[PDB]
Design an enzyme around this catalytic site. Structure first.
Site, PDB file in Angstrom:
ATOM      1  N   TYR A 113       0.807  -1.199  -0.048  1.00  0.00           N
ATOM      2  CA  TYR A 113       0.156   0.287  -0.144  1.00  0.00           C
ATOM      3  C   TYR A 113       0.668   1.327  -0.135  1.00  0.00           C
ATOM      4  O   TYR A 113       2.699   0.733  -0.292  1.00  0.00           O
ATOM      5  CB  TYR A 113      -0.240   0.272   1.764  1.00  0.00           C
ATOM      6  CG  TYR A 113      -1.675   1.002   0.964  1.00  0.00           C
ATOM      7  CD1 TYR A 113      -2.853   1.080  -0.296  1.00  0.00           C
ATOM      8  CD2 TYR A 113      -2.823   1.610   2.157  1.00  0.00           C
ATOM      9  CE1 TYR A 113      -3.735   2.122  -0.126  1.00  0.00           C
ATOM     10  CE2 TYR A 113      -3.566   1.937   1.793  1.00  0.00           C
ATOM     11  CZ  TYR A 113      -4.667   2.156   0.500  1.00  0.00           C
ATOM     12  OH  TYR A 113      -5.587   3.041   1.176  1.00  0.00           O
ATOM     13  N   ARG A 126      -6.123   9.314 -11.861  1.00  0.00           N
ATOM     14  CA  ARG A 126      -5.126  10.541 -10.514  1.00  0.00           C
ATOM     15  C   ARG A 126      -4.698   9.462  -9.675  1.00  0.00           C
ATOM     16  O   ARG A 126      -5.475   9.766  -8.639  1.00  0.00           O
ATOM     17  CB  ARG A 126      -6.288  11.485  -9.904  1.00  0.00           C
ATOM     18  CG  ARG A 126      -6.509  13.058 -10.849  1.00  0.00           C
ATOM     19  CD  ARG A 126      -5.550  14.225 -10.611  1.00  0.00           C
ATOM     20  NE  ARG A 126      -5.618  14.809 -11.696  1.00  0.00           N
ATOM     21  CZ  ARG A 126      -5.673  15.328 -12.960  1.00  0.00           C
ATOM     22  NH1 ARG A 126      -4.625  14.612 -13.172  1.00  0.00           N
ATOM     23  NH2 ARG A 126      -6.087  16.306 -14.060  1.00  0.00           N
ATOM     24  N   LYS A 182      -6.583  -1.966  -2.969  1.00  0.00           N
ATOM     25  CA  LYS A 182      -7.424  -1.760  -1.873  1.00  0.00           C
ATOM     26  C   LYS A 182      -7.774  -3.628  -1.625  1.00  0.00           C
ATOM     27  O   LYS A 182      -8.291  -3.036  -0.266  1.00  0.00           O
ATOM     28  CB  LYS A 182      -8.047  -0.780  -2.703  1.00  0.00           C
ATOM     29  CG  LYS A 182      -7.908   0.658  -3.027  1.00  0.00           C
ATOM     30  CD  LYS A 182      -7.875   1.234  -1.650  1.00  0.00           C
ATOM     31  CE  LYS A 182      -7.256   2.939  -2.244  1.00  0.00           C
ATOM     32  NZ  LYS A 182      -7.182   4.227  -1.709  1.00  0.00           N
ATOM     33  N   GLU A 236     -11.880   4.197  -7.623  1.00  0.00           N
ATOM     34  CA  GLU A 236     -10.672   5.592  -7.214  1.00  0.00           C
ATOM     35  C   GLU A 236     -10.128   5.987  -7.873  1.00  0.00           C
ATOM     36  O   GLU A 236      -9.771   5.415  -9.202  1.00  0.00           O
ATOM     37  CB  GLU A 236      -9.928   3.643  -6.722  1.00  0.00           C
ATOM     38  CG  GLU A 236     -10.230   3.130  -5.448  1.00  0.00           C
ATOM     39  CD  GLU A 236     -10.264   3.920  -4.222  1.00  0.00           C
ATOM     40  OE1 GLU A 236      -9.339   4.402  -3.996  1.00  0.00           O
ATOM     41  OE2 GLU A 236      -9.913   2.453  -3.128  1.00  0.00           O
ATOM     42  N   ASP A 237      -9.236   7.069  -8.110  1.00  0.00           N
ATOM     43  CA  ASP A 237      -8.159   7.857  -8.600  1.00  0.00           C
ATOM     44  C   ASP A 237      -9.009   8.277  -9.851  1.00  0.00           C
ATOM     45  O   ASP A 237      -8.198   8.183 -10.760  1.00  0.00           O
ATOM     46  CB  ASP A 237      -7.411   6.824  -8.132  1.00  0.00           C
ATOM     47  CG  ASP A 237      -6.509   6.686  -6.785  1.00  0.00           C
ATOM     48  OD1 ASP A 237      -7.353   7.134  -6.181  1.00  0.00           O
ATOM     49  OD2 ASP A 237      -5.789   6.436  -6.947  1.00  0.00           O
ATOM     50  N   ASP A 262     -14.110   6.370  -2.869  1.00  0.00           N
ATOM     51  CA  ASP A 262     -12.819   6.291  -1.470  1.00  0.00           C
ATOM     52  C   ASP A 262     -11.920   7.704  -1.231  1.00  0.00           C
ATOM     53  O   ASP A 262     -12.205   7.533  -0.672  1.00  0.00           O
ATOM     54  CB  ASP A 262     -11.843   5.424  -2.140  1.00  0.00           C
ATOM     55  CG  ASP A 262     -11.266   4.615  -0.873  1.00  0.00           C
ATOM     56  OD1 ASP A 262     -12.274   4.680  -0.095  1.00  0.00           O
ATOM     57  OD2 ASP A 262      -9.815   3.520  -0.912  1.00  0.00           O
ATOM     58  N   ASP A 263     -11.520   8.316  -2.888  1.00  0.00           N
ATOM     59  CA  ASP A 263     -11.691   9.695  -2.241  1.00  0.00           C
ATOM     60  C   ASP A 263     -12.434  10.931  -1.929  1.00  0.00           C
ATOM     61  O   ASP A 263     -12.192  11.523  -0.789  1.00  0.00           O
ATOM     62  CB  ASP A 263     -10.573  10.155  -4.199  1.00  0.00           C
ATOM     63  CG  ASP A 263     -10.255   8.773  -4.299  1.00  0.00           C
ATOM     64  OD1 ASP A 263      -9.426   8.495  -4.230  1.00  0.00           O
ATOM     65  OD2 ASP A 263     -10.737   9.298  -5.978  1.00  0.00           O
ATOM     66  N   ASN A 286      -0.548  11.050  -0.656  1.00  0.00           N
ATOM     67  CA  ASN A 286       0.347  10.503  -1.110  1.00  0.00           C
ATOM     68  C   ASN A 286       1.011  10.525  -2.238  1.00  0.00           C
ATOM     69  O   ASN A 286       0.610  11.106  -3.176  1.00  0.00           O
ATOM     70  CB  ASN A 286      -0.209   8.932  -1.115  1.00  0.00           C
ATOM     71  CG  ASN A 286      -0.843   9.567   0.393  1.00  0.00           C
ATOM     72  OD1 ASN A 286      -0.474   8.781   1.552  1.00  0.00           O
ATOM     73  ND2 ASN A 286      -2.712   8.532   0.391  1.00  0.00           N
TER      74      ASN A 286
END
Lengths: 565, 553, 565
Positions: free
Chosen positions: C113, C166, C184, C256-257, C279-280, C421
């Site tokens: 991760y 992203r 994830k 995600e992203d 999740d973001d 991150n």
């Protein structure tokens, strides 16, 4: 030269299938014909392979299995129903199928082979179909190799292939011809001892001219009339290419039931590149010659002295004739067209005569002797006064009472060979031949006939069918690694079969020994065809074994169940 | 600590796909599907529809001479192309049902060992004790919803066929799919082999079971309660366990002991009771009246005997509000010894005492028929041709339209034929039987006798217990089913003399029975698929397996 | 209603794959990650499954296996090398991989991760590739269902999907984004207890704008710039269709992203039809709110009275802010725009103010209060005088000495959240935050930082990463059969996490308990998110269990070795 691997390093753009191997257990094992033992799986084997529960508790022997299948086979009423039950078993337990067929070969052969196998081909589309064999269509051009790759055995030794154009004496059954190759190859195993897994039944579908099958909604082939010339040829030469690349040159390609014109160009073109053999031309010729030699042991004489009349100047017609004339040339040292001076063939248009050669088919010209035009077989029989009458017409009941009586009148023991199949196309029955000749004919036929009783004596007519020859001849070409078929091997075979004909079978009026000996017969034919292969230096399994008979018997598939982990 | 089986999943193509019944489409594989799955060449060029496939199999099925031969051809197809087998069975259900089900399925069980066998169902022997769960593990489908299980003790009216009983469970479960719409994959045919007492089969060299006489008491019980343990641990509690063809003694202790722990159902006691009650309700629409007013005489006081009787008395109690012990006054059973009367309670079997009313011993069914003067004559004897001309004539003499129910199977054990019942009653009987009979003609009129066989009930009742997630079987669900079937019986089928609609409608019937048995499950609060759907019929129809070919390219 | 099986019996022309099931043994079993136990296969299992010989004689325990892998993992000396060794084990022995990861979660988490998983994504193409997850390209449109069909698990409960636009704070990694979903979902199993086999990592490849990756010869995606508008949308809505048809409506789809504009339209249009979660936006918002509640237990106070300054007004920016304002509205009963008055975000163009709204991005307007335009975060920090500084910029070291010192000057205990991150994009380090604030800051960050020493004391900065939330929140939506996400479940989660934060972890300066408790945390978050699902009547596993925590713990995957027969 004999290991020319230059042609085998074109294995880069060869299509291949990525096979995976896995241990078989549970339903995978039971649904696998090659391994499936049904209730014959021992207690230990069931625990071992996750069968416990999927089978009832009872363990049968293979022998009890045979007794049980035999019992339920005999309760089916029509022969076609016993053919369906036989093909089903072949495709669920292969070892039980073969062990049964061998131990019961005389009873079962008419159901898996001629004559039943003929009906099976006529009604193939409408019959309950577990798949067997491989179909290469006109629509597989460019991609024949792709089709070969789908077969899940790489090590192929014997191919049996038809385009369905002349299935037995029934004519064009197009794509439904597959019954024949599948039949032949089962016999290759049962009669010859070839392993099943190295045998590959193929049908080439190019269409069919059979109007009944074009309009039948269960026909399994292309609904189009046969492709001719150019279009046909390209598929064949691509097929012949593809077989070579995949299986190599030592692979036997047995042609079955093609038309005259084709069956010959295929033996002509591919004799040099391939190990090609034609059951109709070469295989039938072989068993007939053996029948003649066996006949002349009962009655006396040589091939030279006899006079031959054929009904049907096709493949088997000219093919049998040419192998007879050749055997004479080897015995007499005469030029070949002094050996065929006493051999006469009658086709659709009548007796083949020189006066008619100004408009004849090419492969008939060598039989166009000097004689008056005759229109019917009856006219020829009476004029030529032959010692031997062979029927390859595909037409039933053309050996009439007048004709067998005429033949019984000038010969004291006339040699009558009713070769056409199935039974309904037999030129005469065994009963007609023994009755119309007052018990004096030496009779044999293509399809089986029961023993005939006449004036307090029993006549067991022999079966002059190429199934006595090709199992031994095939095993021979394989166990020697022969790269070509030589006319001299057909003779070697004919010799071998004829030399198995003893008094035991002559007593009962049979030119051949019973099928209950076909394992012994095939080994002796194999040893002979191999010996000839070595002598001619066309064999590649060097050095030759000391004892070619005991070697041939040791190479033979046995269908006894072996035990699994 | 759990024994577990490491299953591996792989894409099927070539001979693996063709040898797989669940997927194999034979010539119905489209060109595109063959290229896709490495079939090109292994099949001939021609692509058939499923419909042409049906026509083709049907044509060759009719050329077999014996029914047993058509049973063998049907079981072979089930085990090569499962989708063609079910789509064929549905489209031809009336013609084919006698060959896969009663009466053919009886002969199949008598000669099971000698018949060509592609394996189907699971056998748990006495030699699998300690390891029954290990045996379960071998079945290659984990999601089991319907089990159908026999120990072979009483196959139809043919008695003890030991391990060869398997024909029945395999039959029932095929019908669960064809008639009810349960997916095949969730159905598990089981046979418990504990031995057999049939001396002919012990000495027959093709018998597939243990060559020993049946284990009794102690030894028997252990296997069963280990079986019942093992099923529950593996498949859970919502798995339907349908018991088939056990003896009286056992079939009752199994419904008694496992009513709490399991979802248990008995086709002989509960299933037959259900369809008979539906027949009676359907009869009383043709002839008129109520269950209350009728008088019932049974030949045979077994499972189906007392079972049918108890469900009749219950339906009376719900219609009259009388106590059950009062609703049995009108219901009389005749066994081997004669009419069941209280006078002989000084050595009676316990489960018969509730039918031991007030009367002095009568010897034969003929004596009872004449004394009791019944409205309804039901045969559950297992004995053929015990409904004689004298008996049918007697019944036709005092009733104007007598209700005769000949339940025993197969056809050879039917208490009378359809022809005998309509002839010996001058066309006036309301007749139904366990095994199918062709239409009967009587002075230029056609009588289609109904089939009073639990095959009309259990497919719908099973689907219902499943789609609702019922955890128990309640006497009230048998009634819910009985009502549902009866309420499908229109004048179209009554006109022709049939208490039931033709099997050509069994998909409609099963959905309505399912919706009813589910509704009752929710009402009684035994259902676990909460909340209940708005339209329980349209939900039941949408949960139904269809055998039309699933598309691979 | 609820059970609308109308759309499930309209799956008739649905593409399906004909799966065959067979007992695994020998090399099939060893090459199967799901089952493969390597040397941990017992003697009895080896005899049973034809392993005898393929393994050395020695039988290891799972524990010895863990010790052995751990030992060889420590000799790899880049983190990326330990990520490669971890992904390799995941894909050879899944049970050893998970049992190791759980028992060693604190040591290993930075490698599988954040931050390692970031580098893995930047260099994905050039890394040794055991295949993982499913890729749906632009050239799978029309045939997305066909692609889904290829995945060898039918029962999917959790999907995790990215379009790679992203990835963390690293921007556009196109098709190489797959590292994230795979990461994830491993955590979903290790942290949450979801079975691995119900988890499906997906990447949607529509191209990439990363010029470095277009010209890199190891890029695994389409060599084209991203498809926009019409073309993009159709793939997504076909994807979202296809997921529904195959897996049903109860399947969790975790986005995600994605970029802001997309990540929002996906939560907007598929909130009704699907169980969608981001999740973001939602997951980060959730864990941040929990961090704030945990912070206010160490220092005292309410969310209402704090003043919030954000660097970065994207998904996580506005998303965290909106979840804070919502929690305030539920605590105060105030109108929502009174809850936003003390929340300020700073983007690329500076402090978001209403004077600038005559050309603002839409999802920013609700934060455009009245104030004079400020250019830098430093200007805002000094003017607004916030109590809470949250960084979601994707830009490292933007929380400067000036900014942390400014924050330490007007607050006595300033709440600093450095969320970006990986570590290299952290707005500050744990070292900087505790030094520049004289040991007075409540600090937490997205990527892990070792304990920090200052004035003879140890500070254990907490990890404010959505990995504390989504494992529990996912398990909850599943074990309840939730069909929708409601903002109220994000809050239920936030509360559940915060209420696991005791003095044991507050003593050391950490807002969250250590990851060595994440099994307990996920069960309590699950029980809460489930309870809220039932309360809102969006659950379909009726009736609710008595004890929602003990039920959640009993649904949790254990990677201890099963015993095989």
């Amino acid at each position: 030269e004999k290991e020319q691997e230059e042609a085998a390093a074109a294995s880069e753009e060869l299509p291949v299938m990525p096979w995976a191997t896995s241990v078989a257990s549970g339903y995978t094992l039971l649904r696998d014909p090659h391994h499936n033992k049904g209730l014959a799986f021992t207690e230990e084997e069931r625990d071992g392979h996750y069968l416990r529960g999927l089978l009832p508790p009872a363990v049968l022997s293979q022998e009890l299995q045979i007794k049980k299948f035999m019992n339920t086979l005999r309760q089916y009423q029509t022969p076609l129903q016993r053919y369906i039950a036989m093909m089903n078993l072949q495709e669920t337990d292969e070892r039980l199928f073969y062990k049964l067929l061998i131990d019961n070969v005389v009873e079962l052969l008419p159901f898996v082979y001629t004559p039943t196998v003929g009906e099976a081909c006529q009604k193939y589309g409408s019959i309950f179909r577990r798949p067997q064999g491989l179909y290469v269509s006109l629509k597989d051009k460019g991609k024949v190799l792709e089709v070969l790759r789908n077969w899940p055995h790489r090590n192929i030794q014997v191919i049996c292939v038809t385009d369905g154009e002349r299935i037995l004496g029934l004519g064009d059954l197009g794509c439904q011809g597959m019954g024949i190759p599948v039949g032949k190859l089962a016999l290759y195993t049962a009669l010859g001892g070839v392993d099943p897994s190295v045998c590959l039944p193929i049908t080439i579908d190019v269409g069919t001219n059979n109007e009944k099958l074009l309009n039948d909604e269960f026909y399994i082939g292309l609904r189009q009339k046969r492709a001719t010339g150019e279009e046909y040829d390209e598929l064949i030469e691509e097929f012949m290419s593809a077989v070579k690349q995949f299986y190599g040159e030592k692979v036997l390609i047995q042609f079955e039931d093609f038309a005259n014109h084709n069956a010959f160009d295929l033996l002509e073109k591919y004799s040099k590149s391939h190990l090609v053999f034609n059951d109709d031309i070469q295989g039938t010729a072989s068993v007939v010659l053996a029948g003649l030699l066996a006949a002349l042991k009962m009655v006396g004489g040589t091939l030279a002295e006899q006079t031959y009349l054929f009904l049907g100047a096709g493949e088997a017609g000219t093919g049998i004739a040419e192998l007879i004339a050749l055997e004479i040339s080897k015995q007499t040292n005469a030029p070949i067209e002094e050996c065929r001076k006493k051999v006469w063939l009658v086709d659709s248009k009548g007796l083949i005569v020189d006066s008619r050669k100004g408009s004849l088919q090419p492969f008939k010209k060598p039989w166009a002797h000097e004689h008056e035009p005759l229109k019917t077989l009856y006219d020829a029989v009476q004029s030529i006064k032959p010692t031997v009458l062979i029927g390859t017409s595909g037409v039933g009941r053309t050996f009439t009472k007048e004709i067998i009586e005429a033949m019984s009148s000038f010969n004291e023991r006339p040699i009558i060979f009713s070769l056409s199949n199935p039974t309904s196309h037999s030129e005469c029955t065994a009963e007609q031949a023994y009755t119309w000749s007052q018990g004096r004919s030496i009779f044999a036929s293509g399809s089986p006939f029961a023993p005939v009783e006449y004036e307090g004596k029993t006549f067991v007519p022999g079966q002059s069918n190429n199934a006595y020859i090709f199992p031994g001849l095939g095993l021979g070409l394989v166990i020697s690694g022969a790269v070509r078929v030589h006319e001299d091997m057909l003779l070697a075979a004919s010799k071998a079969l004829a030399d198995q004909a003893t008094q035991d079978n002559f007593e009962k009026g049979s030119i051949f020994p019973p099928f209950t000996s076909i394992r012994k017969i095939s080994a002796h034919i194999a040893a002979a065809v191999a010996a000839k292969a070595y002598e001619l230096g066309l064999a590649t399994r060097l050095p030759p074994p000391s004892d070619l008979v005991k070697y041939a018997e040791n190479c033979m598939y046995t269908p006894v169940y072996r035990n699994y982990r």
